[PDB]
């Protein structure tokens, strides 16, 4: 009839997209399951158009290829878009109104007993662009749309046709075809989820595992975890790139001659390091984030005193609060302290430890070189994007620099300041949560601008002053031997007991002293000079 009696969808390749399959099955072929008599008794018409769209390389063409064989359908007629056009006058419109002849004939012959004929138009946006483009030339690019629309709308009661159109850019499709009665249902295919990536990895490595060609060491769960934003095509590319390494240990291409070890050919086996190297080669094209924050804390933590622990605990308390309660849908925090004490690192550490689904960081590095309007659009888009997922953390770094503050005018950009002021107070749509954490070093300037009323709580980050903390960081940095680390601290105790430096400057001085002369005469000289 319409679905084969022997089919369960478990065999078919497509994996990771199950909800979309159910939606398509429910809204497309459901009405053609019962005997016809019910439908007219219920006063419901059949659906005629189906549209699939998504980013490049998500699996739509695979669905189109396998649907015909999977669901006992008549061999679908497949035509690439730009193959319709032709040279002689009137040839193209004929070519379009030559595909539907079989359906018309079968309908006329057998009434409602006619089977289902399906034709799918690959690259739909190729020919059916906007029919008001203009150009003052050959109009064969317009009568094509008119012919298809005439045979799809003024069908003369053809109710046994389903057209499927797959595209990558919906915006370019002519709006006239997006209306009831013509391509009604639109299904979006997006990037897979973690469980879908495990399914894709299993499907891709099925045959490799079956023939004992994969070493037992490999663990698919770890790989699924590592590939943060890989689509299906990139996963397949990763698989074969990793296999290339294993291939290239017996056959040495270039070096020497062709030396094929006929014995290791039977022992060919992939391993984990090959997969890690393949991860090194292939890169995703989506990215967004989860790398800038990691590099922002590259130097790592040191726990040189209790203040770090207390601040981290407070951050944990706030993340717990935003995670549990349903009445607190917005929390904002300020992190302020002397310059160079280390603030962005602390915020990035808390955000990474939180483990929320959505995380991002706004810093002057990204915005550099843009025009003011571009900066405003970028900030607005980033906020709007953050308003999407159920839980969200957003970090704002060095507020004063985002506004171009220089104390000679004083000159600053008022538009950006006002946008940030209004945005930091906007609660997200219903049943969503946000945690904003912004850091600054010019507390007084923020006080003067009178934007201090939009922050719920403030956290100070005093720099270190006790020689014990200096000794701790020294031992953690492995600057010198134990005797030298003791001697430097005893000398500095009497050289300059009072101490106010920071953290960044300490590491910089440590490295410069390592390079030139690890003895006192350089490290202690610089340390005293800075303070």
């Amino acid at each position: 009839a319409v679905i084969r009696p022997d089919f369960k969808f478990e065999d078919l390749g497509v994996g990771g997209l199950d909800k979309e399959f159910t939606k398509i099955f429910r809204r497309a072929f459901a009405s053609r399951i019962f005997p016809p008599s019910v439908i007219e008794k219920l006063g419901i018409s059949h659906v005629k158009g189906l549209l699939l769209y998504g980013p490049p390389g998500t699996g739509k063409t695979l669905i189109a290829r396998k649907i015909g064989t999977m669901l006992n359908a008549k061999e679908p007629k497949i035509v690439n878009g730009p193959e319709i056009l032709s040279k002689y006058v009137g040839s193209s419109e004929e070519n379009i109104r030559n595909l539907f002849k079989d359906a018309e004939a079968e309908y006329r012959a057998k009434g409602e007993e006619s089977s289902l004929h399906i034709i799918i138009f690959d690259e739909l946006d190729s020919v059916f662009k906007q029919r008001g483009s203009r150009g003052d030339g050959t109009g064969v690019g317009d009568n094509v749309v008119n012919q298809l629309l005439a045979k799809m709308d003024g069908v003369d009661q053809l109710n046994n046709i389903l057209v499927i159109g797959m595209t990558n850019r919906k915006d370019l499709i002519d709006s006239a075809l997006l209306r009831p009665g013509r391509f009604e249902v639109q299904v979006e295919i997006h990037l897979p989820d973690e469980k879908g990536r495990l399914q894709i990895f299993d499907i891709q490595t099925k045959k490799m595992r079956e023939n004992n060609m994969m070493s037992d060491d490999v663990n698919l769960a770890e790989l699924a975890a590592l590939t943060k934003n890989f689509s299906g095509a990139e996963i397949e590319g990763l698989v074969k790139s990793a296999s290339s390494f294993a291939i290239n240990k017996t056959v040495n291409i270039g070096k020497g001659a062709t030396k094929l070890n006929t014995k290791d050919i039977a022992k060919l086996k992939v391993t984990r390091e090959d997969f890690l190297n393949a991860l090194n080669d292939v890169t995703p094209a989506f990215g967004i984030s989860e790398e800038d924050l990691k590099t922002c804390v590259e130097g790592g933590m040191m726990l040189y005193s209790e203040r770090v622990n207390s601040i981290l605990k407070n951050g944990a308390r706030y993340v717990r609060q935003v995670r549990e309660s349903d009445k607190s849908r917005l929390v904002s925090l300020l992190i302020h302290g002397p310059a160079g004490s280390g603030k962005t690192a602390l915020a990035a550490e808390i955000a990474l430890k939180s483990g929320f689904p959505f995380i991002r960081l706004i810093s002057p590095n990204e915005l550099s070189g843009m025009s003011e309007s571009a900066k405003i659009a970028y900030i607005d888009n980033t906020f709007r994007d953050a308003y999407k997922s159920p839980l969200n953390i957003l970090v704002i770094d060095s507020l004063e620099t985002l506004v171009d503050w220089v104390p000679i005018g004083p000159r600053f950009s008022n538009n950006i300041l006002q946008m940030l002021k209004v945005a930091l107070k906007r609660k997200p749509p219903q049943d969503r949560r946000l945690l904003i954490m912004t850091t600054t070093s010019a507390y007084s300037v923020l006080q003067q601008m009178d934007i201090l009323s939009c922050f719920d709580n403030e956290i100070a980050v005093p720099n270190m002053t006790n020689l014990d903390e200096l000794n701790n960081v020294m031992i953690e940095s492995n600057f010198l031997d134990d005797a030298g680390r003791v001697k430097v601290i005893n000398e500095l105790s009497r050289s300059c007991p009072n101490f106010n430096v920071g953290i960044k400057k300490t590491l910089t001085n440590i490295e410069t002293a390592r390079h030139d002369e690890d003895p006192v005469n350089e490290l202690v000289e610089l340390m005293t000079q800075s303070a």
């Binding site: 040279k87 002689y88 006058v89 009137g90 150009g135 003052d136 030339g137 050959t138 064969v140």
Partner: peptide, 12 residues
């Protein structure tokens, strides 16, 4: 400040 090209169809 615009210009335009031109294409050609053969005879039916």
């Amino acid at each position: 400040g615009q210009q335009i090209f031109s294409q050609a169809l053969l005879n039916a």
